[PDB]
Amino acid sequence: ADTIVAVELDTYPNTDIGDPSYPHIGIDIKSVRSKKTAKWNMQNGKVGTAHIIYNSVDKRLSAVVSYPNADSATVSYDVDLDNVLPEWVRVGLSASTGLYKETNTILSWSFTSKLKSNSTHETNALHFMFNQFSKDQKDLILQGDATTGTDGNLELTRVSSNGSPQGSSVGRALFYAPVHIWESSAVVASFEATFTFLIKSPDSHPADGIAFFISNIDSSIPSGSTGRLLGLFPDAN
Amino acid sequence: ADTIVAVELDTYPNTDIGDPSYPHIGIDIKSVRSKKTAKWNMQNGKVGTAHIIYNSVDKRLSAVVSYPNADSATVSYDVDLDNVLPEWVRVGLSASTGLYKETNTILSWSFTSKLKSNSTHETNALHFMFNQFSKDQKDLILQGDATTGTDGNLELTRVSSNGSPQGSSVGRALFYAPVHIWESSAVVASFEATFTFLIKSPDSHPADGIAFFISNIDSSIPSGSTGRLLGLFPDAN
Amino acid sequence: ADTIVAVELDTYPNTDIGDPSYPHIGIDIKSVRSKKTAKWNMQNGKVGTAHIIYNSVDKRLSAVVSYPNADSATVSYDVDLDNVLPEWVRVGLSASTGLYKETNTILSWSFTSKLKSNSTHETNALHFMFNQFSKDQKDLILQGDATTGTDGNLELTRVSSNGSPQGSSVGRALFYAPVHIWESSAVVASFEATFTFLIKSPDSHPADGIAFFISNIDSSIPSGSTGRLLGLFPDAN
Amino acid sequence: ADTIVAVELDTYPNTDIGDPSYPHIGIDIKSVRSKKTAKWNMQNGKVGTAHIIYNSVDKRLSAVVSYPNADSATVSYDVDLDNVLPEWVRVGLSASTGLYKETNTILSWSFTSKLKSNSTHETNALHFMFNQFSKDQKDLILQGDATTGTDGNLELTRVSSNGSPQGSSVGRALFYAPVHIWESSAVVASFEATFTFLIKSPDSHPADGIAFFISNIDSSIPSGSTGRLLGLFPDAN
Ligand SMILES: CO[C@H]1O[C@H](CO)[C@@H](O)[C@H](O)[C@@H]1O
Numbered sequence: 001a002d003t004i005v006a007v008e009l010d011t012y013p014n015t016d017i018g019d020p021s022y023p024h025i026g027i028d029i030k031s032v033r034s035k036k037t038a039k040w041n042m043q044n045g046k047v048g049t050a051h052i053i054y055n056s057v058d059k060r061l062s063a064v065v066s067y068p069n070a071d072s073a074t075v076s077y078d079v080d081l082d083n084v085l086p087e088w089v090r091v092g093l094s095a096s097t098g099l100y101k102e103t104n105t106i107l108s109w110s111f112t113s114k115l116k117s118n119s120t121h122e123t124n125a126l127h128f129m130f131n132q133f134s135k136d137q138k139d140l141i142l143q144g145d146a147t148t149g150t151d152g153n154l155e156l157t158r159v160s161s162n163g164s165p166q167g168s169s170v171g172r173a174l175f176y177a178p179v180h181i182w183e184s185s186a187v188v189a190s191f192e193a194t195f196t197f198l199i200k201s202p203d204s205h206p207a208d209g210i211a212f213f214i215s216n217i218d219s220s221i222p223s224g225s226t227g228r229l230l231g232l233f234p235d236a237n
Numbered sequence: 238a239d240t241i242v243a244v245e246l247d248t249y250p251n252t253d254i255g256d257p258s259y260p261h262i263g264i265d266i267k268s269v270r271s272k273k274t275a276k277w278n279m280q281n282g283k284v285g286t287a288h289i290i291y292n293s294v295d296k297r298l299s300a301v302v303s304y305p306n307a308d309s310a311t312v313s314y315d316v317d318l319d320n321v322l323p324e325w326v327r328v329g330l331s332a333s334t335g336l337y338k339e340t341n342t343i344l345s346w347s348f349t350s351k352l353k354s355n356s357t358h359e360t361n362a363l364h365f366m367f368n369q370f371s372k373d374q375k376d377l378i379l380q381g382d383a384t385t386g387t388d389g390n391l392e393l394t395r396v397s398s399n400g401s402p403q404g405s406s407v408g409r410a411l412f413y414a415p416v417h418i419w420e421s422s423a424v425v426a427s428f429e430a431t432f433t434f435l436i437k438s439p440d441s442h443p444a445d446g447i448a449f450f451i452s453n454i455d456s457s458i459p460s461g462s463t464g465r466l467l468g469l470f471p472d473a474n
Numbered sequence: 475a476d477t478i479v480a481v482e483l484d485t486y487p488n489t490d491i492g493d494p495s496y497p498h499i500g501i502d503i504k505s506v507r508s509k510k511t512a513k514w515n516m517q518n519g520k521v522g523t524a525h526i527i528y529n530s531v532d533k534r535l536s537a538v539v540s541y542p543n544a545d546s547a548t549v550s551y552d553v554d555l556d557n558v559l560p561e562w563v564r565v566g567l568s569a570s571t572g573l574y575k576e577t578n579t580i581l582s583w584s585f586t587s588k589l590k591s592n593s594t595h596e597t598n599a600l601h602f603m604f605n606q607f608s609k610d611q612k613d614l615i616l617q618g619d620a621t622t623g624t625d626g627n628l629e630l631t632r633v634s635s636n637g638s639p640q641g642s643s644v645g646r647a648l649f650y651a652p653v654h655i656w657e658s659s660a661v662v663a664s665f666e667a668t669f670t671f672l673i674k675s676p677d678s679h680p681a682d683g684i685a686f687f688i689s690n691i692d693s694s695i696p697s698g699s700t701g702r703l704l705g706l707f708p709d710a711n
Numbered sequence: 712a713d714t715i716v717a718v719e720l721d722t723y724p725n726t727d728i729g730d731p732s733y734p735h736i737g738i739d740i741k742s743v744r745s746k747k748t749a750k751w752n753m754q755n756g757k758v759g760t761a762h763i764i765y766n767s768v769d770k771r772l773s774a775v776v777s778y779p780n781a782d783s784a785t786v787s788y789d790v791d792l793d794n795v796l797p798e799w800v801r802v803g804l805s806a807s808t809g810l811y812k813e814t815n816t817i818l819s820w821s822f823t824s825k826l827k828s829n830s831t832h833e834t835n836a837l838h839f840m841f842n843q844f845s846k847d848q849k850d851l852i853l854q855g856d857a858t859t860g861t862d863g864n865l866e867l868t869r870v871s872s873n874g875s876p877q878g879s880s881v882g883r884a885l886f887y888a889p890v891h892i893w894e895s896s897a898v899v900a901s902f903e904a905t906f907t908f909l910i911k912s913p914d915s916h917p918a919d920g921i922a923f924f925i926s927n928i929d930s931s932i933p934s935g936s937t938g939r940l941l942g943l944f945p946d947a948n
């Protein structure tokens with residue numbers, strides 16, 4: 001089925017599928033039940049930044065999420081990604097709403113991947129940076145309810161003309177080129193991702209979250225992954 | 238037809254279709270008949286480097302070609318590319334042989350495109366660097382006889398089982414993602430491309446050349462563009 | 475005296491020394507009497523961005539100054555910087571006030587310089603980026619009235635406690651390390667600089683201007699270079 | 712006196728001061744007696760590469776040293792550099808010889824430092840890359856016997872007119888500008904360095920090693936630090 005490695009910024013606690021009782025960031029390796037989670041004091045209506053890093057020497061996937069003038073929330077998990085992902089993957093951003101909702105607006109997204117093979121000075125690298133998203137963003141594969149161009153931002157889920165987010169929405173944006181995330185001959189392989197977001201709920205419970213994910217090239221939103229499954233997993237096992 | 242802007246490293250003089258009597262480098266805006274050329278002392282068997290630059294403030298497309306510890310050849314041509322290209326394009330390398338041949342080996346290729354819109358610091362960028370090509374290079378669209386992996390090099394043209402170049406061979410390699418080369422509200426847009434090559438002909442008349450090109454997203458090798466046409470033009474007009 | 479190559483953002487027309495009768499942008503090659511100028515529709519109190527570029531193939535220095543949602547002013551001048559500057563230089567920003575004043579606030583500054591030798595893939599490069607300045611910015615040499623850390627900004631000229639800009643002030647900030655701007659054996663050399671500024675005046679006319687400059691490593695403010703000489707030149711010749 | 716954090720490529724075992732009995736790489740935090748080492752299969756006369764990385768989320772310093780088509784040695788140590796270093800430092804390479812000698816040639820060196828503060832998208836960065844070194848490399852501070860320009864390389868220790876290394880030699884090369892390696896107000900701070908080296912010993916047993924270090928700005932070679940102290944430490948404690 002799809003192979004997903006994700007860093008989720010989960011705003012709604014689904015204690016039934018193992019979520020902690022508060023907003024949290026977590027690392028998901030092929031399941032929505034995070035291998036590692038950390039509390040996140042989500043600030044509704046404020047722009048935040050998420051930063052994810054990994055390198056093949058330390059084999060640790062780490063993430064930092066923060067808001068200006070506030071404490072960060074960090075989570076790390078040791079994982080050798082060549083035992084989990086195909087070597088060519090596609091990276092993206094995913095989001096969803098269920099009964100409760102929130103806007104899942106992405107204001108900027110950048111990614112850098114590098115593979116140093118055992119050949120002096122030969123580094124293969126891919127870097128993309130988006131600080132504005134256009135109406136016809138031909139280098140992004142949009143799935144589900146995702147739209148771009150609106151205010152130069154990327155709306156992962158449905159927002160109405162007045163600005164209210166909609167329930168039961170799911171949307172994803174993937175970078176068009178495959179990324180060679182690992183290689184057996186590389187001395188060092190590394191990647192870093194950064195994205196700023198604006199999650200705003202009009203009421204007391206925002207839902208559901210935003211996730212940065214890495215997947216097999218041909219990944220598609222699994223059926224029924226709205227709400228708690230962050231448009232990433234088919235079930236909650 | 239295909240809207241092609243290219244920088245050719247042409248080794249064979251096809252005087253009938255306007256090539257000057259010597260190997261040269263030329264800027265091709267939509268035609269094989271270069272709008273500007275400069276003499277190039279091709280050094281058979283040596284690794285050369287080609288660097289191409291362009292920015293929208295100056296609107297001058299420039300290329301420089303050099304071999305270590307030897308002269309460099311340079312050619313420049315002023316052209317407002319927003320009037321020649323679509324805003325989304327694909328960039329690539331092309332090459333060919335006709336009666337005469339030469340290996341058209343690419344050892345490294347990097348490219349960087351940046352668009353700075355009217356809003357300060359919101360730069361959109363794309364950068365890729367290939368210093369080693371894998372047998373299955375999933376981020377390259379190879380069209381024609383190009384093969385990756387042998388020596389960790391990109392062979393744009395057919396080379397026999399035993400290392401010899403083959404005649405009437407044509408090949409192209411394009412980066413998978415579309416590139417947003419220009420944008421209406423961009424204050425500055427620029428790109429840079431560099432690639433090292435190895436052209437070795439077993440004969441006293443190496444032919445036909447290597448060319449860096451920018452084209453419409455769905456460009457294909459034209460029918461019969463072998464030899465003199467370098468895999469880019471349909472005719473020689 | 476010192477060897478100065480500068481891009482001025484001149485807010486006060488000193489018709490007597492050759493200025494246009496309107497705010498303008500100019501390229502000064504060792505004299506305050508610009509070799510080339512362009513009209514500039516300065517917007518008092520708004521954050522602007524200036525981009526300066528140059529490469530040894532074209533030997534053209536170009537600058538573009540812009541405000542969001544407005545046209546940009548552009549100026550270019552062909553000049554071979556290898557015949558004007560020493561191969562090692564320092565780069566910095568300069569500003570002054572005279573009878574009239576204006577804040578000369580720098581909100582961000584980045585620079586990148588590359589020198590490619592004719593020895594293949596052997597690029598030497600220097601890049602710095604400041605999006606905020608600290609009270610103790612050890613990698614900057616502050617000259618005159620320039621101070622850092624005032625709300626993370628660099629104030630090149632005097633601004634009193636209550637916010638008022640002061641008359642007869644001059645300040646310069648140069649990056650600490652020398653920069654290898656050109657070299658004989660280099661195939662291509664280029665640099666690019668970008669800075670955002672905030673020019674605000676309370677009085678009728680703002681004065682005098684902000685300039686991006688490149689100089690000999692040991693350059694200092696000429697005495698009396700307040701006002702029209704922008705903290706860069708000794709006299710008006 | 713100085714605060715030194717270093718990654719040594721130790722070619723000579725001095726078992727008396729805690730060295731393993733084989734060539735090794737190690738992480739020295741204020742002492743030549745490494746807090747962690749890894750066995751290194753040093754190859755006499757071959758160009759090697761070392762990569763050093765660190766980030767403030769993981770707080771792990773790691774190094775990988777490798778030769779083309781041979782395997783790599785890797786070593787990591789968990790250390791919070793915010794508690795060991797000053798926030799402003801200088802970075803450099805150091806090397807020494809004693810009774811036994813070896814060439815300690817650096818053929819290339821690059822460094823990148825990044826710091827994102829408590830403001831949106833406000834990263835400060837510094838990056839430098841040297842693939843060629845000139846006779847008067849003004850952006851490097853050379854200490855002891857270190858010289859540049861010989862073959863376009865950096866010789867950290869004495870080498871005679873023919874190419875033979877000298878014993879009892881110490882040399883260091885530091886980048887000119889201070890580097891802001893950490894700040895309280897940062898969300899993420901990281902750095903990476905890479906250098907290629909050529910260690911060749913005619914006298915069969917090479918000694919003593921090359922080290923990448925980070926120090927207080929004003930660091931100088933400790934007197935008596937030739938041999939086993941690698942130009943970094945005052946004694947063997
Ligand atoms: C109350 O349960 C529903 O709403 C929450 C929040 O939207 C979702 O997580 C869940 O999957 C359901 O759709």
Ligand SMILES: CO[C@H]1O[C@H](CO)[C@@H](O)[C@H](O)[C@@H]1O
Nearest residue numbers: 249334335336337444464465
């Ligand atoms: C002589 O003509 C043939 O050979 C030359 C050089 O190969 C090609 O340019 C041409 O298109 C034909 O194939």
Ligand SMILES: CO[C@H]1O[C@H](CO)[C@@H](O)[C@H](O)[C@@H]1O
Nearest residue numbers: 486571572573574681701702
């Ligand atoms: C009136 O002249 C003074 O003020 C103007 C504008 O401030 C400056 O240009 C000039 O050099 C003097 O300092």
Ligand SMILES: CO[C@H]1O[C@H](CO)[C@@H](O)[C@H](O)[C@@H]1O
Nearest residue numbers: 808809810811918937938939
């Ligand atoms: C014999 O001891 C000397 O030589 C060895 C190897 O060079 C060094 O480690 C040591 O510090 C002394 O200088």
Ligand SMILES: [Ca+2]
Nearest residue numbers: 010012013014
């Ligand atoms: Ca949840």
Ligand SMILES: [Ca+2]
Nearest residue numbers: 249250251256
């Ligand atoms: Ca031809």
Ligand SMILES: [Ca+2]
Nearest residue numbers: 484486487488
């Ligand atoms: Ca003036």
Ligand SMILES: [Ca+2]
Nearest residue numbers: 721723724725
């Ligand atoms: Ca030792």
Ligand SMILES: [Cl-]
Nearest residue numbers: 708709710711
């Ligand atoms: Cl005067």
Ligand SMILES: [Mn+2]
Nearest residue numbers: 010019026034
């Ligand atoms: Mn969760």
Ligand SMILES: [Mn+2]
Nearest residue numbers: 247256263271
């Ligand atoms: Mn031609």
Ligand SMILES: [Mn+2]
Nearest residue numbers: 484493500508
């Ligand atoms: Mn003027």
Ligand SMILES: [Mn+2]
Nearest residue numbers: 721730737745
């Ligand atoms: Mn040791």
